[PDB]
Amino acid sequence: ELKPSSAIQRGPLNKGGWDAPHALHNDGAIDRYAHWRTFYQERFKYTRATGKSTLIFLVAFPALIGYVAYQSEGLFEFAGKRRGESVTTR
């Protein structure tokens, strides 16, 4: 007994314009491939290879470049130099 009112007269929605003809034959294999590649993260799972790359690029490489960066803060000036002059501060 509750229906939206009679004075609506709602019509269809177009997007309008010119039917651009198909400039591309889509490949089913290429489209399935690319849809698998962009949405890879919803099927990603941890394995030993994932653990190896996640260890080395997220943990080991920041720690190595970290140690190298904190050791070498005020070591080197080369600004005006001479023979027999050490360039390391330490």
């Binding site: 399935r32 698998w36 890879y40 099927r43 990603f44 799972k45 394995t47 290879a49």
Partner: peptide, 26 residues
Amino acid sequence: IRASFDKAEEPMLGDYPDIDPFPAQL
């Protein structure tokens, strides 16, 4: 299938055919 990283990608794929990788030059 043939390469090692192709085997490393195997448990990720789901509903994807997993075909034999062969070089397009050979």
